[PDB]
Design a protein around this ligand. Structure first.
Ligand code: 624
Length: 237
């Protein structure tokens, strides 16, 4: 996260850090608890990933340093990538992680509510992007979970900032005209959480963008509300 600040422990209880154990363990992407055994994240996070066996999901984390060899984690039983996904910039950058065990909800770990189709006309004015991602284009994973408030921008506007791409209705953008605050490398798969009516809603999934926090270059996120039926379909046993 660029231009953000340290989060308060348990402030974003649905936020998980997805680690890979290959070649040595390291943070790979962000993700969001949406079910007792379901993590919603970004499909592009799995480039090269051949098996769920090398994945480890850690919940209730604030600092990466909390994560050691003796720290409990959730194994991944299945990786479900949208069959229409090809690359981040094209869309359908969404994926589900079916955990090998169920998450016991608590103040440090609980699920975030999915947006409702009737919530497509709502104007979210209190959105935040979070992650252990880069603070600078060429930096490294951050120890403490960062947060940044970022206003949403209409797709028409986003399109103007990305004339080389096609911004579809299954995408949603957020950023400041002058940049300064944005998601960056390592925040991918993480949530774009918007508080509406005293309830936090998973509005988007950190997907892509040109550089980080650049002026006139909003971050592009997967528009979650467009995938509620897909999510129901893939999670319904
Ligand atoms: C994600 O942490 C980052 C988040 C960056 C979002 N940036 C922003 N709001 N300014 N994701 C990517 O870098 C995704 N991605 C891209 O955004 C582009 N953008 C073009 C316009 C330059 C290109 N390629 C990717 C991409 C990166 C990595 C993989 Cl493995 C794949 Cl398949 C695509 C992370 N995503 C992966 C690791 S960190």
């Amino acid at each position: 996260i660029v231009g953000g600040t340290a989060s308060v422990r348990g402030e974003w209880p649905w936020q998980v850090t997805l680690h890979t154990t290959s070649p040595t363990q390291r943070h790979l992407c962000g993700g969001s608890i949406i079910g007792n055994q379901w993590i919603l994240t970004a499909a592009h996070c799995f480039y090269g990933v051949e098996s769920p066996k090398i994945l480890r999901v850690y919940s209730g984390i604030l600092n990466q340093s909390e994560i050691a060899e003796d720290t409990s984690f959730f194994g991944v039983q299945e990786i479900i990538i949208h069959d229409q996904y090809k690359m981040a910039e094209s869309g359908y950058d969404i994926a589900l992680l079916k955990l090998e065990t169920t998450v016991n909800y608590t103040d440090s770990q609980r699920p975030i509510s999915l947006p409702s189709k009737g919530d497509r006309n709502v104007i979210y004015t209190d959105c935040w992007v979070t992650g252990w991602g880069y603070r600078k284009l060429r930096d490294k994973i951050q120890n403490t979970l960062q947060k940044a408030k970022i206003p949403l921008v209409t797709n028409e506007e986003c399109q103007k900032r990305y004339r080389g791409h096609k911004i579809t209705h299954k995408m949603i953008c957020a950023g400041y005209r002058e940049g300064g605050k944005d998601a960056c490398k390592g925040d991918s798969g993480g949530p774009l959480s918007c508080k509406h009516n005293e309830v936090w809603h998973l509005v988007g999934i950190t997907s892509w963008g040109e550089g980080c926090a650049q002026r006139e270059r909003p971050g592009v996120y997967t528009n979650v509300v467009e995938y509620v039926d897909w999510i129901l379909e893939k999670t319904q046993a």
